[PDB]
Design a protein around this nucleic acid. Structure first.
Ligand SMILES: [Zn+2]
Lengths: 60, 99, 182, 59, 107, 99, 240, 175
RNA sequence: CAGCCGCGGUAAUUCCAGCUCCAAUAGCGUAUAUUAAAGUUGUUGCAG
């Protein structure tokens, strides 16, 4: 009478492979991650430009 | 819809009057005059309508899903705050019982 | 007067041309802007009444709790202040210092009960209508806004007949009878 | 209510019993109707629908 | 002027409702009311690099709306998504109610 | 689930309308009934509010908008279905230009 | 590539956003009809007939200042009437964009030390007349103290470890009080033995030691790894 | 042909801007979480560490007979640079002539020193501001309030005199 | 509050697809006892 368990829990290595992929997909949400620079032609910002938001750390 | 009776709604205050406008039965001149464009313009109209309803239904789906998110975050947040307040009201009684 | 400099804010601080100590926060000005009192000195001829009833309620509290002169006069005062509608109930004599207000004795005025029972829609237009002479309490016309009412006469605040705004609301609801001349 | 009983004697035997629809609307049977035999008059919490089934849980 | 706003009034709606043009694009949440001063302009891709960003002479158009209407994959997606939104929105309203009543009535 | 089995918190499936009683479609169950009942109750609540306002109209009620706004023969409210920034009847020279 | 965008003014004066399905940071073109480093352009027909004026796409992967703008800086001091002293005008890449943001009524002094970039700077400053190219080392501002007077903002895109001394010398000579100091700090080019936050903290401390009050810093992370823009103002009396 | 409802014009305390309480006639700012951080790791700090000291940490160091730089070195097993801000130094000088030993142990050439640029000598405000600006700092402190502030802001390791040597908590590579 | 219990049904059923998520992982819980941390007092706590 066991609960249904996880194929990813059946290997200790694959679980940390797939909770690190989840973590570094969440890291793109909190920060802005340097992906590697300009790939091809500069197409544009592809997601929008906000002219009201300033995401910069003010001093004191 | 809410069908308020005529005997009630004729005896309503001036602020609470119900603005219910009757349908038009006469083929009026401005409606029989006014021109609509065809072909590329009617498919532009169809396209703009499809785009606007897809945008509105996507926004309604997003805000309903956010409502379902934040009611369960409210539930777990209230449980964590109740546990915290229980811990505070026993630690205060500990402090005063020692002092 | 010049939004003074800093060595200026410090050198003289109690200077204030606008609001003095004896203005009491301009409560007379504030409550007559609220309830739209035409002339001056109405506030203070109500405040004298408030001071007189709290003074004689004080000396009715002074007299011993057994004599019928004291108890008859405090129930008589409480019933008269209910009968002019200054109060809303016949409760404790502690309400004769907590609940009597120059505000409430302005609440019993004729334009503000008019705005209260929605005869006008603002107190300014109420004073417009009763300076133009449209309303009446029972038979007689009312010209001045200083006529406050009693608890019986919030039922016969009505316009006069041939008042043409009464005629416009009747022809709005198209119940406009004209055998009754309005 | 139409057919849970075959006779007004049966409904008379079962008067006052609490029934309910499948919607959980509680109810009570009140009196057997005269001419259609197993048909009776019940009163409910509010207006039940034509797509419901009433239930008398017995043992 | 309003005379020119009544010519570019449709692609401003497209830019306002960007977020539901492609099902894979997913912009960041701004509102974007119509700005008070704007200007409609055309991209000059120069004569240096070819074939990559190059939209040819035979397919250059005059609005954003004609490009979106010429896209045939977007037409597939808009027609399909609109039909499923339609049949969700008419799910139980009045044709359902009167066919339920006719179901009651037929027997 | 602290001491509960997953074979214990199973899924009980719900039953359909009887096929003999099938012309009255969809045997409705308790979620359907509460969707019915709270709709009825909110509409009765707003009807009761409007009935109370009709009882407390106070017929000496003058507004300035009861010069422009008017009332049909049965006593209800005429709401002009065109504009309220336009005019329904247009002048003779306007008709000359449009024609 | 032949599509149509709508131009819209940014929060920052003198720079614009072209909204399409991907929106572009965009500046007006001071020399219409040619591109400087191969960026794309937008030609609007603004209303004698209407005139075709045009606009240039500012590429954030080829401009630290554009990476700062579209990461979100609360205040640039590069403004449409100003004077900017560009230090490390390594080619005409960002100096052209700073030049036409600053406009025809303002001046950009483009200081560069190498000579083939200086040749390209002079040939670009022909068609952009509001650029004064100065081929000189910024580590000795006295060698060109005669050519420049009283700038309003300094921008520093130098990539040398004596950056803060260069910025301080040029500010004390040519910047005015409460003027702008925009710095692009590259951690790896200052020093690579410490981490990026240590070198940014040290550079900000060096700026306030040379009495430039920092207002704001931004990491500008999706376009450059381990970079920063520090925006400060030249306080000259009382950082407190 | 006069007007109706005529009043005497008085001043409006709700409206008149000539008086003082009526002298009160958008761009957001969401500061991004630092690129030095993983989720709560602070992956970027590396030895040689640099540690901001405050006054009760110095007092507890002398009360427990720990050297500053040697206690830091055998706590972290790394080379430390300790930093006394001018406000921490101002606080030690304001502590009076009872704390002369602590002041002239903070006067040490091995302890480097920063230059804070603000008014007042509130070291807790200065340490909190300059650590949440930059995330390249260890905070050595023993104030309960400052310890709670620092361990609520993420990615900042906290050092404290405990027992007879220094302890470190939010630094995940100590051994 | 809870719910392996429902009308039928056990060769019957195919069902929230075996409900979802989390952490450790050849290891992982529980009970009891514990150690360390400083708020270390400046008095008076009973019926002497
Ligand atoms: Zn300080």
């Amino acid at each position: 009478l066991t609960p249904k368990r996880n194929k990813d829990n059946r290997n200790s290595r694959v679980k940390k492979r797939k909770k690190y992929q989840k973590a570094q997909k969440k890291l793109k949400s909190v920060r802005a991650v340097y992906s590697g620079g300009q790939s091809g032609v500069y197409e544009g910002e592809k997601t929008g430009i906000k002219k009201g938001l300033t995401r910069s750390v003010k001093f004191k | 819809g809410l069908k308020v009776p005529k005997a009630v709604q004729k005896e309503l205050p001036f602020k609470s009057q119900i603005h219910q406008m009757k349908p038009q039965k006469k083929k009026t001149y401005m409606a029989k005059r006014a021109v609509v464009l065809g072909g590329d313009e009617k498919k532009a109209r169809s396209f703009i309508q499809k785009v606007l309803t897809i945008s509105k239904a996507k926004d309604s789906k997003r805000k309903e899903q956010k409502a379902s998110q934040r009611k369960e975050r409210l539930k777990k947040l209230a449980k964590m705050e109740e546990e915290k307040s229980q811990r505070d009201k026993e630690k205060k009684k500990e402090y005063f019982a020692q002092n | 007067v010049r939004k003074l400099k800093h060595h200026e804010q410090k050198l003289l601080k109690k200077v204030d041309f606008l609001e003095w100590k004896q203005d009491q926060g301009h409560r007379d000005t504030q409550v007559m802007r609220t309830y739209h009192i035409q002339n001056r000195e109405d506030y203070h001829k109500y405040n004298r009444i408030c001071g007189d009833i709290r003074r004689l309620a004080n000396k009715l509290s002074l007299l011993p709790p057994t004599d019928p002169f004291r108890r008859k006069h405090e129930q008589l005062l409480l019933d008269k202040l209910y009968a002019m509608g200054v109060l809303t109930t016949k409760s404790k004599i502690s309400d004769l210092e907590n609940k009597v207000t120059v505000s409430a004795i302005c609440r019993r005025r004729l334009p503000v009960i008019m705005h209260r029972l929605k005869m006008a829609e603002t107190i300014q237009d109420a004073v417009k209508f009763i300076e133009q002479g449209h309303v009446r309490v029972g038979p007689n016309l009312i010209n001045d806004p200083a006529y406050l009412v009693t608890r019986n006469m919030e039922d016969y605040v009505t316009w006069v007949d041939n008042s043409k705004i009464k005629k416009t609301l009747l022809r709005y609801r198209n119940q406009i009878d004209d055998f009754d001349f309005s | 209510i139409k057919d849970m009983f075959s006779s007004a004697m049966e409904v008379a035997r079962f008067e006052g019993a609490q029934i309910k629809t499948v919607s959980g609307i509680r109810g009570e049977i009140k009196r057997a109707l005269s001419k259609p035999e197993g048909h009776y008059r019940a009163a409910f919490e509010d207006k039940i629908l034509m797509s419901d089934i009433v239930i008398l849980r017995s043992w | 002027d309003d005379n020119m706003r009544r010519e570019v009034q449709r692609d401003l709606l497209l830019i306002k409702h960007r977020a539901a043009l492609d099902p894979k694009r997913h912009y960041k949440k701004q509102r974007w009311e119509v700005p008070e001063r704007f200007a409609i302009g055309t991209i000059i891709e120069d004569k240096s690099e070819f074939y990559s960003s190059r939209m040819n002479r035979k397919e250059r158009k005059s609005t954003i709306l004609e490009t979106l209407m010429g896209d045939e994959a977007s037409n597939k997606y808009f027609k399909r998504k609109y039909n499923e939104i339609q049949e969700k929105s008419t799910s139980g309203r009045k044709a359902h109610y009167k066919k339920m009543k006719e179901m009651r009535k037929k027997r | 689930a602290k001491l509960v089995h997953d074979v214990q918190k199973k899924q009980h499936r719900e039953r359909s309308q009887l096929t003999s009683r099938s012309r009255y479609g969809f045997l409705e169950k308790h979620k359907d009934y509460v969707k019915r009942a709270q709709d009825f109750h909110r509409k009765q609540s707003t009807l009761k509010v409007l009935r109370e306002k009709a009882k407390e109209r106070n017929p000496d009620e003058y507004y300035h908008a009861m010069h422009s706004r008017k009332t049909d023969a049965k006593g209800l409210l005429i709401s002009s279905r065109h504009g309220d920034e336009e005019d329904e009847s247009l002048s003779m020279d306007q008709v000359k230009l449009l024609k | 590539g032949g599509a149509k965008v709508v131009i819209e003014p940014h929060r920052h004066a003198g720079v614009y956003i072209a909204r399409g399905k991907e929106d572009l940071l965009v500046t007006k073109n001071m020399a219409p009809g040619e591109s400087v480093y191969g960026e794309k352009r937008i030609s609007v027909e603004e209303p004698v007939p209407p005139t075709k004026v045009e606009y240039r796409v500012w590429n954030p992967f080829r401009s630290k200042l554009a990476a700062g703008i579209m990461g979100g800086l609360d205040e640039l001091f590069i403004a449409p009437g100003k004077k900017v002293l560009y230090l490390g005008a390594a080619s005409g890449t960002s100096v052209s964009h700073v030049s036409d943001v600053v406009g025809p009524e303002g001046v950009v002094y483009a200081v560069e030390f190498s000579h083939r970039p200086g040749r390209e700077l002079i040939s670009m400053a022909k068609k952009r007349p509001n650029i004064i190219p100065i081929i000189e080392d910024a580590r000795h501002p006295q060698k060109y103290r005669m050519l420049i007077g009283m700038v309003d903002c300094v921008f520093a895109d130098v990539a040398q470890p004596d950056q803060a001394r260069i910025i301080a010398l040029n500010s004390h000579m040519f910047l005015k009080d409460q003027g702008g100091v925009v710095i692009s700090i590259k951690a790896n080019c200052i020093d690579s033995t410490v981490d990026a936050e240590t070198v940014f903290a040290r550079e900000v401390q060096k700026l306030r030691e040379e009495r430039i009050k920092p207002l704001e810093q931004l990491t500008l992370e999706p376009y450059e790894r381990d970079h920063c823009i520090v925006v400060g103002r030249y306080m000259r009396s009382g950082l407190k | 042909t006069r007007k109706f409802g005529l009043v005497k014009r008085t001043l409006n305390t709700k409206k008149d801007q000539r008086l003082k309480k009526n002298q009160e006639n958008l761009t957001r700012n969401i500061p991004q979480v630092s690129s030095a951080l993983f989720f709560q790791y602070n992956q970027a700090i590396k030895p040689p560490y640099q540690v901001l000291i405050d006054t009760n940490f110095i007092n507890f160091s002398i009360q427990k007979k720990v050297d500053i730089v040697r206690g830091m070195m055998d706590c972290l097993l790394a080379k430390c640079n300790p930093l006394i801000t001018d406000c921490v130094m101002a606080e030690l000088e304001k502590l009076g002539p009872k704390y002369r030993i602590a002041l002239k142990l903070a006067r040490d050439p091995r302890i480097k020193r920063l230059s804070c640029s603000h008014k007042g000598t509130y070291a807790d405000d200065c340490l909190v501001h300059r650590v949440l600006q930059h995330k390249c700092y260890i905070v050595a402190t023993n104030d309960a309030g400052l310890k709670q502030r620092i361990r609520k802001i993420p990615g900042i390791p906290l050092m404290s005199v405990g027992g007879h040597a220094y302890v470190i908590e939010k630094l995940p590579d100590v051994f």
